[PDB]
Design a protein around this ligand. Sequence first.
Ligand SMILES: [Zn+2]
Length: 263
Amino acid sequence: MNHPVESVYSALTSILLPYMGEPVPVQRNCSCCGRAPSEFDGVGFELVNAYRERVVHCRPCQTFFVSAPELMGVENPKKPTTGQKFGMWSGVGAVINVEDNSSVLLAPQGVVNKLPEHFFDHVEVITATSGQHLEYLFNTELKFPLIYIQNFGVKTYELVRSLRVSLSADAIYTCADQLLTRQNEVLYMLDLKKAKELHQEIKNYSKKEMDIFIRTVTLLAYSRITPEAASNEFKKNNLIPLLLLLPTDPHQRLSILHLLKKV
DNA sequence: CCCTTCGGGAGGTGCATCCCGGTCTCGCTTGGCCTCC
Ligand SMILES: [Zn+2]
């Protein structure tokens, strides 16, 4: 019940409620999310994947493998009878407001074209490419707690095991279909608050000074310029407060810079 | 058991290339289609 996949299912993937059929009583944990059957009420959906493996998917997890062409359009014309699947979308993200239980889908223009009219009635979709997810997140007033999926991808198991509720703008957890180990959440953690304050205070600096700051910090985070050189560049360009507002972590620096150069 | 020399003088110049030709990949899942059992 109170797990990350359940919220995204209720808010976003409940649109294909008609297109699964009834569950089946199961006696083994859902291989996709991995949690225990005790929170499935003893029911589950059996399935066999493209690799011929018997896998049990619970109610909110099985929705990532449902074929609903009459709702989700056709994903590949070579196979008309299998429409877009939530677990197979690559480049498509979403933002799910758990407390409101609503969802907004960030799909590129191609996917939006492939989606039928009936899809938009249940889920509001805004055309945005993979790089434009950050633009929507920055510009639009997010409502927390929320689940921000960045790349539905094709590795549905890793996607569901990477879902994490973003309790506030200080730490928005991106779910990019890559298994969110404790080693790599720095690459999937976005601090919209720090990026927002840095963007607010960057207005005081020239465009040339901006380019200089971004390039210097990027090179430093990639160890392509010595720290003394970067310090000289910051001091000569009066970029000290900007560095003071940057995280010490170089990967977070790169992430927030990537966000900055998108907005 | 002598007594070992002087110094002259020390380059001038050439000529220093052309051209190629810089790769595939793939890190996922699924169904359609092919033959196999
Ligand atoms: Zn599950």
